Design a binder for this molecule. Sequence first.
Ligand SMILES: *[C@@H]1O[C@H](CO)[C@@H](O[C@@H]2O[C@H](CO)[C@@H](O)[C@H](O)[C@H]2NC(C)=O)[C@H](O)[C@H]1NC(C)=O
Ligand SMILES: *[C@@H]1O[C@H](CO)[C@@H](O[C@@H]2O[C@H](CO)[C@@H](O)[C@H](O)[C@H]2NC(C)=O)[C@H](O)[C@H]1NC(C)=O
Ligand SMILES: *[C@@H]1O[C@H](CO)[C@@H](O[C@@H]2O[C@H](CO)[C@@H](O)[C@H](O)[C@H]2NC(C)=O)[C@H](O)[C@H]1NC(C)=O
Ligand SMILES: *[C@@H]1O[C@H](CO)[C@@H](O[C@@H]2O[C@H](CO)[C@@H](O)[C@H](O)[C@H]2NC(C)=O)[C@H](O)[C@H]1NC(C)=O
Ligand SMILES: *[C@@H]1O[C@H](CO)[C@@H](O)[C@H](O)[C@H]1NC(C)=O
Ligand SMILES: *[C@@H]1O[C@H](CO)[C@@H](O)[C@H](O)[C@H]1NC(C)=O
Ligand SMILES: [Cl-]
Ligand SMILES: [Cl-]
Lengths: 429, 429
Amino acid sequence: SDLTVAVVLPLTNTSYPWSWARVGPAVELALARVKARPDLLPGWTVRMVLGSSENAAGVCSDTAAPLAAVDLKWEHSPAVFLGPGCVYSAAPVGRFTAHWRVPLLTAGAPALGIGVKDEYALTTRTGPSHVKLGDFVTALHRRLGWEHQALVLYADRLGDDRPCFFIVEGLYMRVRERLNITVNHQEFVEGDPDHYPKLLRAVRRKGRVIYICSSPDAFRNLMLLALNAGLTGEDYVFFHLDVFGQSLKPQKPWERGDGQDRSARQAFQAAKIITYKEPDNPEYLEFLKQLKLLADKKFNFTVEDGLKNIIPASFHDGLLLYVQAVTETLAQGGTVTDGENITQRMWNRSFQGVTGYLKIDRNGDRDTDFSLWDMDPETGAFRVVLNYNGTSQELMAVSEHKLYWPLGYPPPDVPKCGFDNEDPACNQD
Amino acid sequence: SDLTVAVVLPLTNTSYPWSWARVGPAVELALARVKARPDLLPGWTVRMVLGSSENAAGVCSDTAAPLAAVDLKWEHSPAVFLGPGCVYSAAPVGRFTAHWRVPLLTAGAPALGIGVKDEYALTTRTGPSHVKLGDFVTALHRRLGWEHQALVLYADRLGDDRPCFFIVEGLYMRVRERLNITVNHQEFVEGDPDHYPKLLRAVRRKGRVIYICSSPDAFRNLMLLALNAGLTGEDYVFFHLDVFGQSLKPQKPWERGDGQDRSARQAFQAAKIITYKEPDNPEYLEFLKQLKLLADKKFNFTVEDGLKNIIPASFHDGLLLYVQAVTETLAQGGTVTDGENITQRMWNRSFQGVTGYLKIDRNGDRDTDFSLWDMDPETGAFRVVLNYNGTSQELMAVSEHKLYWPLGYPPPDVPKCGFDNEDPACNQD
Ligand SMILES: *[C@@H]1O[C@H](CO)[C@@H](O[C@@H]2O[C@H](CO)[C@@H](O)[C@H](O)[C@H]2NC(C)=O)[C@H](O)[C@H]1NC(C)=O
Ligand SMILES: *[C@@H]1O[C@H](CO)[C@@H](O[C@@H]2O[C@H](CO)[C@@H](O)[C@H](O)[C@H]2NC(C)=O)[C@H](O)[C@H]1NC(C)=O
Ligand SMILES: *[C@@H]1O[C@H](CO)[C@@H](O[C@@H]2O[C@H](CO)[C@@H](O)[C@H](O)[C@H]2NC(C)=O)[C@H](O)[C@H]1NC(C)=O
Ligand SMILES: *[C@@H]1O[C@H](CO)[C@@H](O[C@@H]2O[C@H](CO)[C@@H](O)[C@H](O)[C@H]2NC(C)=O)[C@H](O)[C@H]1NC(C)=O
Ligand SMILES: *[C@@H]1O[C@H](CO)[C@@H](O)[C@H](O)[C@H]1NC(C)=O
Ligand SMILES: *[C@@H]1O[C@H](CO)[C@@H](O)[C@H](O)[C@H]1NC(C)=O
Ligand SMILES: [Cl-]
Ligand SMILES: [Cl-]
């Protein structure tokens, strides 16, 4: 019998981490593995039906995706949906699959709202989610003694899936929930020179521990401006929330060869970069090789190296986790459409996949690991100094390296005389 | 053969102008008329299948409505959808019906966005729409010589269909488009005493011709505060955007018997009320009688008098207009599922219904008539002095009455020395 998987992803646009040009070969690799395991899905064959989350303009849409999901549902009666990856596309589709009582698996849709499973019943996220970034920051603040305040600056592109907004929204709610610190925040538009005076003023007025979600160039410009304004590593720390490591390729993220590298290097003495952790089990490197090969040969697409590859790898691992859950359900006398039973076997469970160890929490979302990159004083090069395990919630040093603090130890998150020092008797020096 | 009409409306909640307790009897009345007209729908019988736009909490929802529409579509293959009425419910349903190429008729969903028919293809609105309010204001400003500025203040209830927001959004875009005046605007929360200082300051600083969308009590309080601050009818005019005439029951909207009626009457010398026009053809009064009777006997609901009744009357008239369009389509050899052909016969067309004359514009939206209520100097009572025909776009005086201006003529929309008079030489007096 056929186990039909309904896919709703960007079938023609290849620019997303979850675009079919990347996810398609990853899924094919997972299915080829299933076919070679007679113990898996005894008596069933996995079949795929494809639908696109894209509108006429070629971008993931909050309307095209649900229209596609309904069409697939009606025509093929799928047992499970794979995707969408975009937050705006997955929100409406997930409400339909919940209503239909059909599981939905995705390594995308990291937004806070998708985490409300009373609404998104049967939605299992096998990739990163933004509230998990909040868990990492919570751990960082506790380890460094920051219990009072932080500022978050962020920018996105006019009409996209608003990645930075959702990153900050998840970080904000979770950090506020666990640390109860004041979290000031504000958006800006990267190409608007009018916003720089406001940002620099907000940095001085509202925070000492600062998080910035922006392009690599916007972060570098802000650091150069901070250095020129005399905001150094003794009093400030700037964390670039660069989950996919776009500013990384030794790593010298401050280098451009534009006549400002000496200043940029100096300015980065006060910066650290937060990224998803690069899987480092040997099975991942082999998957990457097979992924690139198949993507090139059967999907006409060149898959470049980078952290974005954890997404298709997570669709691969998630589909295998689902397969295991269904195999166990059949074994116990249930069937492939027992949505609740199958989902219950995926949540609050560990699994070994190409991305290594992976744990799905009790709310149906995968625990996410992060890496903190810091500067090597001697060379100015950046390297990972701390890794965060999202399951144990422990921060572990890497290679005996210690965190770099320009003049000693971490700056306090509140200035000696407060942010709005109005006490003539308090000497800020 | 059966012509199936899929309904997606509030089936259990009776508080909406488009709730089934009101719309259901209105539709029944229209169907009984069709059954008595053998010339209509030769060989077809209209059948109704019902779905609710309500979520578990009993309010119209942006999710329950489309889930219901899909369920109805699948199970009954309807030829046309009736409803939703709520803006948040109709937006997603309309995108589905457009995709399915099935007509959607509604006397609700007045929001600006629903007017983009490239998206909401086949959606025909037979009731009021908010951009039409913009047409009325345009006409008013031209007649009174207001070519520069206006201020709009508005408030809604925490999680409703945000009626005032959509009213102002439609007014703003259309007025800006046709007059190119500056339109300042701002929201407030009615029960928050903290907002009154800000509102009164914005009135002084930003406008002389002011529009307010709020509850009857919030408008009265604002008028009493304006009078106390010395803002009179010589320099200010306050238009209460009360489309359904909630502040009306002679009409003395300023009366409460709370010890402030003398002041309230005086304060209202500077106020006028904008409402939808009450249909005044004899067929409307008879429809109202039949509606109340049937609603009480078959739907267990007491239909009170009021302008909200134009909504069920417009679902009644719209369904008959649709019937006429389909009858003509059949006559020409087409069939009940020729969505485009049927819709084309409804747009840019006049029709006679219980609400009297009704014209559907070229964009598929009904032209809306409005009434302006003004104070009678002698009694302080309010009465209609001007009526606006949305098709001809002409303003016509009623009963030889003229507009009331406390001290002569309309106040100018810009103060003599400008809003921020900084010219020491200009005497505001
Ligand atoms: C594929 O997706 C990308 C990203 O969404 C599209 O690029 C954007 O296109 C929109 C138009 O809808 C522009 O307003 C943005 O400036 C573009 N942003 C980025 C980051 O590229 C792209 O056009 C889509 N289509 C194709 C064929 O690639
Ligand atoms: C992250 O931390 C968790 C600790 O809970 C590690 O999970 C354990 O992994 C071992 C070996 O895979 C299992 O035998 C245990 O059952 C796991 N414990 C739990 C509670 O699930 C996990 O290995 C760590 N991740 C990495 C990359 O080291
Ligand atoms: C029917 O609809 C009304 C209006 O939407 C509901 O009343 C609101 O209920 C919400 C809860 O979802 C409250 O937050 C609001 O304060 C209420 N506003 C108003 C104007 O009533 C009502 O509860 C719904 N259900 C029923 C049975 O009437
Ligand atoms: C609103 O104005 C329009 C003027 O265009 C009136 O419409 C005319 O109505 C008469 C009688 O019903 C028809 O013979 C004409 O064909 C209509 N003209 C057009 C252009 O459609 C309409 O009657 C007015 N409304 C009211 C209540 O008087
Ligand atoms: C959270 O901390 C702030 C001060 O940092 C305090 O005012 C507030 O009361 C705390 N939260 C709660 C729920 O008390
Ligand atoms: C609209 O009017 C304003 C001043 O009232 C003017 O500055 C503006 O240029 C006008 N619109 C356009 C498109 O020129
Ligand atoms: Cl997607
Ligand atoms: Cl509705």
